[PDB]
RNA sequence: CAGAGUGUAGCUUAACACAAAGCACCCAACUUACACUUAGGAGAUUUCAACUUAACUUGACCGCUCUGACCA
């Protein structure tokens, strides 16, 4: 055997649901692109309709005018209510629901107890004989408490590794430390059940990831977790 | 970021004017697209056959 | 009959195994710049410079002029950097530079040229006329 | 092809040209930072992945041979882009019919 | 000259010239970019094409698919006849790349999906089995290939 | 009456001249050189020297290229060099910065075409 | 099974001046997979009968 | 936590001084796109003193890397 335990970590990420709002510099450029587009385009069928109607009215068989139809479009739009980009969970700061922070990616964190101490880490399982290292990460989903989620794994190679040693208490020749390997996957659809939410798992971004993780553990995690 | 390649303009020598419109999907989600007419919103109805 | 080369071949360093994933030139100017670099380098074969280039003695030519002035580079560089930021801060210069209407005063340029690098250009120009060749051998 | 659809070309004032010209120089620097962050992000992922594989081979060379293999189930991969608003939990779109022109 | 040590100094032909997918690298990947906006598909395909060059990935071909026009009919108010509402046009851009390793695929796929604009659909599939790798070639290409055949 | 190095018909650039105006524009700097047929450089004018750098908003724009020619033209007259050839690529000739550099040399009294050699 | 004749004849890339049976061999002179082989100590032509 | 090692924007054995250079990189226009080209943009000596030229030599200060301490 080996003195380092092999643990197959899993890094489940929630892709952004809504587009991130444009920066003030981007807003200025966005207006310029549309302003240039109008100046370098021909008259549309709607614009040519309005000009002809103006000439005919000035001189004097269309029931609906160009401007009149535009008002109808505006009235229908004001009746429909668009989805709220900022959800209630954002106001409540409930870091357990996927509904929060739709603009940014979310990383799953689960709290586990080691040495009679609770530590927030990524989901992981011990490697077993006759099983690939990637298959260990897929097994972690089955061990979760009442989870119905389909994860999309990208490749087979690990996305990171962390090494730690027992603090001279349980350190032995047969068990000197452990080497975890992080596997990233995409959360296609699904969410946890309502049985256990608060103490079970939380979903935070990379910026708010350091609060839960340890400084040494966070060092190897902020490397394969992007903030784009 | 979704803004990495989002802000662009029509790179055509000849083309008709387009207006920024919202395309509401069948589940309420909306997306910014450019339409021929200045319709403030567009909502795709649900097909009767796909029921 | 074959004879091994007396020196490294021109394109010997190129590896033919991964020829598909090798950066190309893609342009005439990029090849021309590299082509001129190797044309100014010594070669073990016969070259144009061997027969037409002006023969010079391998011994370095002596310098018999005044010793070079002593200037502190760190202070010289800092003062030059500060002037650039002030010039670029003005919006009138940038507008004139963008409109391709700005110009430099030629009289002031030569005043600084004659003090900093003027003597070195004169030495290079004098060598072209061969004044050092005849006056001082 | 008809020239009746052409719109009049309104001249741009000096300030309008000045603002656009200064706006394009700031947009060039803004896009340079986006590429810089993306370039480092790809480098960061590549360095961590390559370093992780080296540690895997030392611990167990058999598991290293499986990580570097391709994933037949990986493709095809389908990912839809974000939307301007989240979906409405309770919404009933109207009825209609879809016809495709090819 | 052949007997001279400088023989072959002028050789250039080996410098210029002289699919199957292995278990470690994917053979050919076709990236489909479906979006209702024509400019978004063109811009994102340009972004992907520029990304492949920076990451040292060969791009076989970047082309466009035929546009499919979709008519949207909405039910008339208090009636049974479908009336014309809007016309939605579907634009697709295909960027074909080959020579991507499995290990580097995880990073490549995550980068592109992160920068995916709104309303743009991403579809990556392999079509090397369909083959159809036949395109018009220039005369020198035919001459060299025919020379091998003889 | 001095012979020009005729030949080099299948390569670029030509060598049938006495003096050549060679413009080197890099990523940050723009440099123009006047060099003899044997390779010796007669006079130089670049944006790297403090004399021209202190009066330029940017050393890589058209203004910098035009300013080099105005400075070089004065140096060409002082050096006694009045005739020189310019051998640009088709894209360099069509470029706007090289057009104004040629204008600066012409307005400075330098003709961009050498007189033909006298054989008889 | 060895075909009597090639399906499609092909022009060889060797020079027309051929010494095909004359001189020492410069190919297939070492063992590749097995341990025993028949060594040729002379030049000749092998046809379908051989 | 010490121990050594190390220092120019991404790279470089570019930097004698006349001078912080060359390439790589970014935007726009041209291209379906890439590429070319044209037209633009951002850049750096870890910081201090040492008889002074010290990006160059010394140490400090500093950051970084590496190996152990530390470690779930």
Curated annotation (Swiss-Prot), chain A:
Q: Which GO terms describe its cellular component?
A: cell junction; cytosol; mitochondrial inner membrane; mitochondrial large ribosomal subunit; mitochondrion; nucleoplasm
Modified positions (N6-acetyllysine) in chain numbering = 179
Q: State the Gene Ontology terms under molecular function.
A: structural constituent of ribosome
GO biological process annotation, one example: mitochondrial translation
* Compartments, as annotated in UniProt: Mitochondrion
Q: Which CDD domains match?
A: NUDIX_MRP_L46 (cd04661)
Whom does it interact with, and what assembly results? Component of the mitochondrial large ribosomal subunit (mt-LSU). Mature mammalian 55S mitochondrial ribosomes consist of a small (28S) and a large (39S) subunit. The 28S small subunit contains a 12S ribosomal RNA (12S mt-rRNA) and 30 different proteins. The 39S large subunit contains a 16S rRNA (16S mt-rRNA), a copy of mitochondrial valine transfer RNA (mt-tRNA(Val)), which plays an integral structural role, and 52 different proteins. mL46 is located at the central protuberance.
Family under the similarity heading: Belongs to the mitochondrion-specific ribosomal protein mL46 family.
Q: What is this protein called?
A: Large ribosomal subunit protein mL46
UniProtKB/Swiss-Prot annotation, chain B:
Residues of the signal peptide: none
> Localized where?
Mitochondrion
* Quaternary structure and interacting proteins, as annotated: Component of the mitochondrial large ribosomal subunit (mt-LSU). Mature mammalian 55S mitochondrial ribosomes consist of a small (28S) and a large (39S) subunit. The 28S small subunit contains a 12S ribosomal RNA (12S mt-rRNA) and 30 different proteins. The 39S large subunit contains a 16S rRNA (16S mt-rRNA), a copy of mitochondrial valine transfer RNA (mt-tRNA(Val)), which plays an integral structural role, and 52 different proteins.
In the record, the note on similarity to other proteins reads: Belongs to the mitochondrion-specific ribosomal protein mL55 family.
Record protein name field: Large ribosomal subunit protein mL55
Q: Which organism is it from?
A: Homo sapiens
**What is the primary gene name for this protein?**
MRPL55
Q: Which residues of the full protein are shown?
A: 34 to 84 of 128
From Swiss-Prot, chain E:
Enumerate the UniProt keywords alphabetically.
Answer: Mitochondrion, Ribonucleoprotein, Ribosomal protein, Transit peptide
**Which GO biological process entries does UniProt record here?**
mitochondrial translation
Q: Where does the record place the modification N6-succinyllysine?
A: 137
Cellular component, GO annotation: mitochondrial inner membrane; mitochondrial large ribosomal subunit; mitochondrial ribosome; mitochondrion
**Compartments (UniProt record):** Mitochondrion
> Superkingdom, according to UniProt?
Eukaryota
Family to which the UniProt record says this protein belongs: Belongs to the mitochondrion-specific ribosomal protein mL48 family.
Q: What is known about its subunit structure?
A: Component of the mitochondrial large ribosomal subunit (mt-LSU). Mature mammalian 55S mitochondrial ribosomes consist of a small (28S) and a large (39S) subunit. The 28S small subunit contains a 12S ribosomal RNA (12S mt-rRNA) and 30 different proteins. The 39S large subunit contains a 16S rRNA (16S mt-rRNA), a copy of mitochondrial valine transfer RNA (mt-tRNA(Val)), which plays an integral structural role, and 52 different proteins. mL48 is located at the central protuberance. Interacts with OXA1L.
Record protein name field: Large ribosomal subunit protein mL48
Q: Which gene encodes it?
A: MRPL48
UniProtKB/Swiss-Prot annotation, chain F:
Q: Name one GO cellular component term.
A: extracellular space
Gene Ontology BP terms: mitochondrial translation; rRNA import into mitochondrion; translation
- Which compartments is it annotated to reside in? Mitochondrion
Keyword vocabulary terms for this entry? Chaperone, Mitochondrion, Ribonucleoprotein, Ribosomal protein, RNA-binding, Transit peptide, Transport
The GO terms describing molecular function are: 5S rRNA binding; structural constituent of ribosome
Superkingdom in the source lineage:
Eukaryota
Chief localization class?
mitochondrion
Work out whether the entry's keyword set contains Translocase.
no
Protein family: Belongs to the universal ribosomal protein uL18 family.
The protein's job, in short, is: Together with thiosulfate sulfurtransferase (TST), acts as a mitochondrial import factor for the cytosolic 5S rRNA. The precursor form shows RNA chaperone activity; is able to fold the 5S rRNA into an import-competent conformation that is recognized by rhodanese (TST). Both the cytoplasmic and mitochondrial forms are able to bind to the helix IV-loop D in the gamma domain of the 5S rRNA.
Subunit and partners: Component of the mitochondrial large ribosomal subunit (mt-LSU). Mature mammalian 55S mitochondrial ribosomes consist of a small (28S) and a large (39S) subunit. The 28S small subunit contains a 12S ribosomal RNA (12S mt-rRNA) and 30 different proteins. The 39S large subunit contains a 16S rRNA (16S mt-rRNA), a copy of mitochondrial valine transfer RNA (mt-tRNA(Val)), which plays an integral structural role, and 52 different proteins.
Q: What is this protein called?
A: Large ribosomal subunit protein uL18m
Report the portion of the entire protein shown.
61 to 180 of 180
């Amino acid at each position: 055997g080996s003195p380092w335990r092999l643990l197959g970590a899993l890094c489940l990420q929630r892709p952004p649901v809504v587009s991130k709002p444009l920066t003030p510099l981007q807003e200025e450029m966005a207006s310029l692109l549309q302003q240039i587009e109008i100046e370098r385009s021909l008259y549309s069928d709607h614009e040519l309709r309005a000009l002809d109607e103006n000439q005919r009215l000035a001189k004097k068989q269309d029931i609906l005018l160009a401007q009149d139809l535009e008002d109808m479009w505006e009235q229908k739009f004001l009746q429909f209510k668009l989805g709220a980009r900022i959800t209630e969970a954002d106001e409540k700061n409930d870091r357990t629901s996927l509904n929060r922070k739709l603009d940014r990616n979310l990383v799953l964190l689960v709290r586990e107890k080691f040495g009679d101490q609770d530590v927030w880490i990524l989901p992981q399982a011990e490697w077993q004989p006759g099983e690939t290292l990637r298959g260990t990460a897929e097994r972690t989903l089955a061990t979760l408490s009442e989870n119905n989620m389909e994860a999309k794994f990208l490749g087979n190679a690990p996305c990171g590794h962390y090494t730690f040693k027992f603090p001279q208490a349980m350190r032995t020749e047969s068990n000197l430390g452990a080497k975890v390997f992080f596997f990233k996957a995409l959360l296609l659809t699904g969410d946890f059940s309502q049985a256990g939410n608060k103490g079970h798992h939380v979903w935070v971004t990379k910026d708010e990831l350091g609060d839960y993780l340890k400084p040494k553990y966070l060092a190897q995690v902020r490397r394969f977790v992007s903030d784009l | 970021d979704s803004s990495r390649a989002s802000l662009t303009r029509v790179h055509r020598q000849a083309y008709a004017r387009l207006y920024p419109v919202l395309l509401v999907k069948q589940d309420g989600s909306t997306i910014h697209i450019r339409y021929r007419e200045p319709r403030r919103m567009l909502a795709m109805p649900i097909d009767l056959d796909t029921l | 009959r074959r004879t091994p080369p007396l020196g490294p071949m021109p394109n010997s360093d190129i590896d033919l195994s991964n020829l598909e994933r090798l950066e190309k030139y893609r342009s005439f100017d990029r090849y021309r710049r590299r082509a001129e670099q190797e044309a100014q380098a010594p070669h073990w074969w016969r070259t144009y410079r061997e027969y037409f280039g002006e023969k010079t003695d391998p011994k370095e030519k002596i310098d018999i002029g005044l010793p070079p002035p002593k200037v502190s580079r760190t202070q010289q560089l800092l003062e030059r950097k500060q002037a650039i930021q002030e010039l670029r801060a003005n919006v009138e210069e940038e507008r004139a530079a963008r409109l391709r209407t700005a110009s430099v005063p030629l009289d002031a340029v030569r005043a600084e040229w004659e003090r900093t690098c003027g003597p070195y250009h004169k030495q290079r120009l004098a060598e072209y006329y061969g004044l050092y060749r005849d006056l001082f051998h | 092809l008809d020239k009746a659809r052409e719109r009049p070309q309104v001249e741009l004032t000096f300030e309008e040209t000045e603002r656009r010209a200064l706006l394009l120089k700031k947009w060039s620097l803004y896009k340079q930072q986006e590429r810089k962050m993306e370039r480092d992000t790809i480098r960061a992922m590549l360095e961590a992945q390559q370093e992780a594989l080296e540690e895997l081979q030392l611990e167990s060379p058999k598991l290293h041979a499986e990580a570097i293999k391709r994933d037949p189930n990986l493709f095809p991969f389908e990912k839809e882009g974000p939307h301007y608003t989240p979906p409405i939990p309770n919404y009933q779109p109207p009825e209609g019919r879809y016809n495709d022109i090819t | 000259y052949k007997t001279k040590p400088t023989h072959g100094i002028g050789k250039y032909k080996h410098l210029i010239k002289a699919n199957l997918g292995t278990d470690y690298e994917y053979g050919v990947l076709n990236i489909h970019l479906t979006a209702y906006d024509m400019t978004l598909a063109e811009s994102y395909a340009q972004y992907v094409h520029n990304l492949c060059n920076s990451l040292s990935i060969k791009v076989e071909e970047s082309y466009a698919m035929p546009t499919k026009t979709i008519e949207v009919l909405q039910l008339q108010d208090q009636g049974s006849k479908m009336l014309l509402d809007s016309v939605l046009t579907t634009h697709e851009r295909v960027v074909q790349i080959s020579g991507l390793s499995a290990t580097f695929a995880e990073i490549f796929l995550e980068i592109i999906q992160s920068s995916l604009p709104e309303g743009v659909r991403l579809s990556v599939k392999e079509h090397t089995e369909e083959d159809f790798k036949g395109r018009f070639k220039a005369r020198p290409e035919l001459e060299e290939l025919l020379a091998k055949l003889k | 009456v001095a012979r020009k190095e005729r030949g080099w018909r299948t390569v670029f650039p030509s060598r049938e001249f006495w003096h050549r105006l060679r413009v080197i524009r890099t990523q940050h700097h723009v440099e123009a050189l006047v060099e003899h047929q044997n390779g010796k450089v007669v006079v130089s004018a670049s944006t790297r020297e403090w004399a021209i750098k202190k009066h330029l908003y940017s050393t890589r724009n058209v203004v910098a290229c035009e300013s080099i020619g105005r400075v070089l033209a004065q140096r060409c007259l002082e050096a006694g060099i009045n005739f020189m050839v310019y051998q640009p690529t088709p894209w360099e000739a069509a470029s706007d910065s090289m057009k104004r550099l040629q204008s600066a040399m012409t307005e400075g009294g330098v003709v961009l075409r050498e007189p033909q050699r006298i054989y008889e | 099974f060895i075909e009597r004749a090639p399906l499609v004849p092909k022009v060889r890339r060797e020079p027309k001046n051929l010494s095909d049976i004359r001189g020492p061999s410069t190919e297939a002179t070492e063992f590749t997979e097995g341990n025993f082989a028949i060594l040729a100590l002379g030049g000749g032509y092998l046809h379908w009968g051989h």
